[PDB]
Symmetry: C3
Subunit: 508 residues, 3 copies
């Protein structure tokens, strides 16, 4: 225990058993149990989904309401004009929006963007009849709601909190625990409380990352089946997941940050090209008209959508969608808010709140109205039988089918194939990075994490994906999200309370 | 006419014939006529209800709209930051809310809270079908509307006006007339104009107080019938009303202010216990879910509910409920606003407007969603046949039946019995006090009113209750409220105009 | 080319070939082609209507949304407190409102005010059933929308822009082109760009003026047929149009500005008398109740109405009405905004925005609810068969029939006859004035335009009316409006961008 041991900040690199082992053990144990009996796992998975959504769905809904309220408080309250770092923004306002407008590009987004409208239209909210005109007229509006300005505004409290911690308090924050000192004290932060918090967070994050794989993988393999004729099987999925891991491993080992960043740029520009293409050849005039109509419908129904539980009719719509999506929002809040904070030094509180909500919803509104308007038309015109395609082949095939129904079919599918593939590479890279940084001992800033830790995490995330795929269907992915959401409900609130308490003292 | 007669402020105690005799004569004459022929009275009662609501319902609706607008003007306008008395508030912000949150406890509230949803659900607005899902889905929302933030916000103009008169102008105000000097001048105030105004007010108030009895009494006697087996009759009602009068008389004569105040505290805490109990054992999960859903529905329909007259379909919904309840709101505005003003010295205008609307609706929202969600479930599950119970026994019995349907039935009914009983004691005490103070000569501050005047008024109010009960049903109570509302429509407006005019001069 | 030619501002009077000839040629050519084959013109007219509304209707809708947003920016933004001229307003606030509240009086307003509800009720939006209760309950609300605070608020940007140009920049502005210097530069303004802009504007205006005639004329002749027995024919219409032209010619030639102004005053006061009469004897109680109900319905549906395209059901409602009316709004924006600017010197930006929206909607709300509530009742009670009347005689006859159905039938029709007649005289006078001023060389301020130019334009406008009448029905009038609207979509936006750019520099 010597010598010269406590004569400075820690300054050495490696794993921190505090937070490295428990996640590994917990996710490992869960994977093993899931695989023991896939049919009984699915039975429990379904019971967990139904229980949380039906019994605690209301709390997820009130969380979004409160956070939405917070956005107004930030935009109009005492902090509106506070600068987040006295320096000038490190980006032009345009590159700043472009960076948000770019982070919207993802594989999960192409998944839900392409298919969620089919579900809204066939099993409508508010007791409407499946496939009726009124079901069709509310379909996109409900996307504009679940992926619009309201959900994005709920990230504002956390984004401002983190930019305040980074740039006014000048704290290095990696783990949630590090922001809670104003709230519970250093004893609790550094003790067991802060350890549990950080471990619950990491588990939720790990599961969430697996779900991203679980959704992105089948899209890529359906593209592969369509383009090359290689049949989509669970083995093809395990093969592609392996390639991503190896690719990641080669990128990390040889430190190709430069190349990965360029890939990130290509995915962003390909996204624009692909959406623009779908718009131009998918029925531009209908899409513009349908979007316009859906805005007014969204504005009218919004308060109804925000507080919807269907307690009389019990059709289950809010439970299946709103609660699940809100859990998705809650799971990714800290992660997304940190990234928004980082690109926002020098901006004012109100500037951050207005800009992020503007640029981010532009991104998501565009994706869901173009892909959703395409899908809706294909259903309307009987070009596809989506129910039949799903019952036979699975959801990912039905999605690929909405893409291949467009002109220049083979070229279009090349575009999408490339998009979903690079997106997943940059997602794996980013995922492995975050997990490594969060489970290793405090290391000098600007330094990359221990390589073997980083690769090891990518492998565990890949395992989770293949199991989710083995389990089959949407339900396992949805329940992993709902599960992770439950703890992070409390973690998110704790970080914002911590910010609010600190700000009383150091922001006046 | 001497001597030394006008060498100071009046400083002596007794009745003021200006305002003591006319009310007595008017209410006496009305009681006598009503009793002459109960069946013809009821016929006229019904015709007065239908006429005012159908022909002048729109004016009651626009009154609430304007007053609601005024709330925004107060919160965002030139007066927002004005303090109501330069002193520090005489209560902590918590005890201040608790005092509003406490004034919500009443017998009339348990009456309407328990039953109004049955009516909304069986004879729905907007042409919906009775007992349909959509009727059930709007039922609580319509309670959240009639007893929510909008009606409470309409008291803000009067509450601010009175706190301005009490604490900035330092005027002793008892009667409405005393605030009108800036508006019509001292001649009119002290002359016939101010006398008519104060007499119309007192008559409306007297009728309104009778209706409180008329509603509270049958609840207590249904509790008595349930608990002790004593059949509910008109004679049992006259007996209980007598006991309240005697109780009041003993409390006043021996000056037991201390004890009455403690009773007030018990009723407040019993209310919390009873509502909490109903919530915990009445279907907590359904109640939370139904409340959440109803908020969104309320937010969506609010503008429609605010301006509703049903002029095409003529189903009569707004006339039966909204207009009647708005008359109820209008009748009690001055009284409630004076009480809100008194507990608000030292608060700013905006503080008063935000706090009262927050604390008061918390109180009323809780009462109507718990009691209404209980009742709705009992109807849903066919535990009770409310229509049958009402046709056979009357509304009060159906209400008691929703309470007795809960676990620990006998204990629960003891809780409610005690609640409605003490509530009525403190209501009678407060009622008799106000009437005495308003009909007697200006007396030195902090002094209790002439005892025989005070008891005499409690007796006249008791008479009005027993007649209302003799008349039977809801209609007589509703028409007395609508009748009183008509004059006070103009009185309320006069006080706020008076405040607005004065404030131009003395508040800048 | 001499001498002393460029030693001052131009200072001489006559036509400016830049902008005098092209309009004349273009409208002349169009008139001639239209008349060549009335049945084929109507076929093309119908195809132009369907194409613009269906394909580009969305752009008209987003234009109103953006302009509406601008109103909030003006009321709450950096310019809210800027004064439009440092002088004191040249009118009392009352005479200022009265002047807006007066400009609402017109023949076109009596036309649409009287009949549009019949169309809303018989061919309802949102897939409702014709003549159903819900169709009737939304009917007036849709008038309150198309002629309410939202459309009036969209004039605020242009009204503020022109008052800024007139009173802060002290520029003489007659033609749109003259405001674009900050936007495109003097070269473009004085060159071809500014010439095209001003010519497109003048053509749109000329067509629009013809439509006013095309609507006002048949109302007057139906009144003439009703009162005097003279059969309504195309020849009677050509005769009345001639009388207006001659009347105008006599008024202009002998410079009877005084008398025309008095006529303007009479029309204003007659309007009040006629509306007040219709209200008092047309079912006051129903009208008050129906208006109240319609406000709440309007507030609830507004966001839905604002963004409505009906892309699924394709019932065509928004295309037939909203898009057409928005084109009407767009066509008259510059003209109306100049007039609002002129009567608003010395007012602040926010004052102009609040006052104009308040006074103007008071005017239009009153007209459409009184005339629309009258018409609705006549349909409800089966006093008239409007469809039958229209198929047989045309729309103008059905309108006159709603007026003649009121008590004192002969006197009422005298009132309306006089109203529509003087209204059209003052409209022709104002129209001819504007066209003259816009097509003639810059002349010294306060000077009347060349008389023969002024009369000549009134004649061309009269021709356009008679052709529109020869074409028959509503469609030609609607398509001329939609046609003119398309160019002025861009002209309106250009003036506001020009104002915004200039204001950055000279308003701080
Ligand atoms: O004096 C103490 C401080 O209080 C203020 O807080 C206000 C802010 O000034 C004010 O902008 C803010 O308004 C937003 C309140 C929350 C509204 C939530 C709803 C917004 C609209 C509909 C969705 C929900 O309300 C806060 C209090 O409720 C501000 O924080 C400071 O300006 C002020 O100094
Ligand atoms: O200059 C004169 C004074 O005017 C102001 O009054 C404004 C206030 O500043 C401003 O806050 C207030 O806004 C509320 C207007 C009423 C809105 C009613 C609607 C509110 C929202 C929807 C329900 C109805 O409007 C008033 C005028 O309409 C304020 O009284 C002062 O700040 C100011 O000095
Ligand atoms: O610092 C730069 C300037 O920015 C401000 O602009 C604000 C204004 O202060 C602010 O009042 C204004 O609010 C209105 C924004 C547009 C809202 C449109 C919606 C309004 C409600 C629903 C219909 C549409 O937003 C502007 C920016 O979006 C103001 O122009 C100045 O006060 C300020 O100095």
């Amino acid at each position: 225990a010597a010598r010269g041991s406590h004569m400075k900040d820690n300054k050495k690199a490696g794993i921190e058993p505090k937070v490295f082992f428990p996640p590994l053990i917990i996710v490992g144990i869960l994977c093993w149990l899931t695989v023991r009996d896939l049919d009984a796992s699915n039975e429990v998975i379904n019971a967990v989904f139904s229980y949380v959504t039906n019994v605690w769905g209301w709390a997820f809904e009130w969380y979004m309401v409160i956070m939405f309220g917070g956005w107004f408080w930030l935009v109009f309250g005492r902090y509106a004009k506070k600068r987040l770092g006295d320096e000038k923004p490190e980006f032009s306002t345009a590159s700043w929006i472009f960076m948000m407008f770019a982070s919207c590009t993802s594989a999960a987004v192409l998944f839900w963007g392409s298919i969620e409208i089919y579900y809204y239209i066939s099993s409508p909210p508010f007791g409407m009849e499946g496939y009726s005109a009124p079901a069709k007229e509310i379909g996109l509006a409900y996307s504009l709601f679940h992926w619009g300005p309201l959900p994005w505004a709920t990230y504002s409290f956390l984004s401002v909190a983190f930019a305040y911690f980074f740039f006014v308090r000048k704290m290095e924050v990696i783990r949630p625990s590090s922001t809670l000192v104003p709230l519970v004290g250093e004893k609790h932060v550094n003790g067991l409380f802060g350890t549990v918090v950080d471990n619950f967070y990491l588990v939720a994050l790990i599961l969430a990352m697996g779900t991203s794989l679980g959704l992105a993988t089948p899209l890529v393999t359906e593209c592969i089946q369509y383009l090359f004729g290689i049949p989509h099987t669970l083995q093809l999925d395990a093969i592609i997941i392996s390639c991503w891991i190896l690719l990641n491993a080669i990128c990390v080992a040889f430190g190709l940050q430069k190349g990965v960043k360029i890939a990130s740029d290509v995915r962003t520009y390909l996204s624009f090209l692909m959406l623009g293409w779908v718009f131009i050849v998918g029925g531009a005039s209908f899409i513009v008209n349908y979007f316009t109509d859906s805005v007014g419908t969204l504005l009218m129904y919004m308060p109804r959508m925000l507080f919807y539980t269907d307690p009389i009719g019990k059709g289950g719509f809010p439970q299946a969608w709103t609660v699940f999506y809100w859990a998705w929002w809650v799971i990714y809040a800290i992660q997304m808010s940190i990234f928004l904070a980082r690109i926002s030094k020098g901006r004012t509180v109100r500037e951050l709140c207005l800009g992020m909500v503007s640029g981010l919803t532009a991104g998501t509104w565009l994706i869901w109205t173009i892909l959703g308007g395409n899908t809706l038309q294909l259903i309307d015109q009987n070009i596809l039988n989506i129910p039949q395609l799903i019952d036979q082949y699975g959801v990912p095939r039905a999605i690929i089918e909405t893409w291949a129904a467009l002109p220049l079919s083979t070229a279009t599918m090349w575009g999408f194939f490339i998009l979903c593939f690079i997106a997943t590479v940059t997602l794996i890279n980013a995922c492995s990075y975050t997990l490594a940084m969060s489970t290793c001992r405090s290391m000098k800033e600007g330094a990359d994490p221990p390589l073997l830790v980083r690769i090891g995490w990518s492998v565990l995330v890949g395992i989770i994906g293949i199991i989710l795929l083995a389990l089959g269907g949407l339900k396992p992915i949805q329940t992993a999200i709902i599960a992770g959401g439950c703890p992070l409900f409390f973690v998110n609130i704790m970080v914002t309370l911590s910010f609010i308490k600190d700000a009383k003292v150091h922001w006046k």
